[PDB]
């Protein structure tokens, strides 16, 4: 399985170049992916992510990360499977659990015709910027190259992914870690 990486609250500067303890929010995504069965990644950018784009071929430029260019998925193009589709924004996302995600994805599919929601339990996630009835998106999903419709399943982990929409959001994404 591949992966992509999704790429104004908090002052809509590009997040994914925000900086904590010293390393980029994209960096802890792309760090799972690649300890990640999942092997390519790519890494959708746009503008006002420019400079991501940047330091991710300069960043990873030796790497097999690849960039791409509202809700833009003109990126079936690349893959001729189904892919992980993350925000850039994750936090205390490990590659154990993306087993288990695209693990999931096939045991399931074990009797299907897809997409993925992954969503945490509200006793979890705290100030959740959207849940559910009860659950809270994590922002990890899995999809098939289409660009209609999909039938989509629900996964639950008890879990904690943290995505960081607001300036609260980074201490407590600082607290975690
Ligand atoms: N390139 C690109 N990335 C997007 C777009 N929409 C969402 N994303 C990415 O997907 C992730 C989830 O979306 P959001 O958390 O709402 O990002 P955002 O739209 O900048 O947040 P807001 O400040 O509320 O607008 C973010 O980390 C973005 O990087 C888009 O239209 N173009």
Do not use: W
């Amino acid at each position: 399985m591949d992966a992509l990486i999704m790429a104004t609250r908090m002052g809509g500067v590009e997040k994914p170049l925000i900086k904590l303890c010293g390393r980029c929010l994209i960096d802890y995504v792309v760090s799972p992916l690649l300890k990640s069965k999942v092997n390519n990644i790519f890494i959708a950018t746009s503008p006002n992510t420019p400079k991501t784009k940047e330091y991710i071929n300069s960043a990873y430029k030796d790497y097999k990360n690849i960039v791409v260019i509202e809700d833009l998925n003109e990126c079936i193009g690349y893959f001729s499977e189904p892919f992980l589709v993350v925000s850039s924004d994750l936090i205390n996302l490990k590659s154990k659990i993306i087993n288990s995600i695209v693990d999931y994805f096939y045991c399931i599919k074990a009797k299907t015709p897809e997409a993925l929601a992954v969503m945490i339990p509200k006793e979890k996630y705290p100030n959740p910027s959207i849940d559910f009835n009860g659950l809270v998106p994590a922002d990890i999903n899995v999809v098939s190259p289409k660009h209609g419709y999909q039938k989509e399943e629900i996964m639950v982990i008890d879990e904690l992914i943290f995505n960081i929409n607001t300036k609260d959001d980074l201490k407590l994404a600082e607290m975690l870690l």
